[PDB]
């Protein structure tokens, strides 16, 4: 860790048949996520090959603003009734080397 921010990279992956629906619902979480303190970036990505794999790149000042993320409404909401949607989340943590 350090000054350098806690970079995270989820890739999520919907259940066969519902990457439409997963998009919708992952597509929400970008606006409110950016405009958080501590947000240095959140971008959301479609995998080239298979569209069932999304991956969300997200960059944190530090723990702190990331632990205050899982407590917005909006983060809390993507929690929220979609647990059928998702076949597999992977969170990888990690930290740009300079």
Not at 29 to 37: I, N, Q, T
Not at 53 to 62: A, G, K, T, V
Request: charged share 25%.
């Amino acid at each position: 860790h350090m000054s350098t921010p806690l970079t995270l990279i989820a890739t999520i992956t919907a259940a066969p048949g519902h990457a439409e629906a997963l998009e919708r619902e992952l597509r929400a979480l970008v606006a409110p996520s950016r405009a958080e303190a501590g947000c240095l970036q959140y971008d959301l990505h479609q995998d080239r090959h298979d569209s069932h794999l999304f991956y969300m790149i997200e960059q944190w000042r530090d723990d702190a603003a990331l632990e205050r993320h899982q407590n917005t409404e909006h983060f809390l909401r993507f929690s929220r009734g979609n647990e059928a949607l998702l076949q597999n989340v992977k969170i990888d943590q990690l930290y740009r080397l300079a």
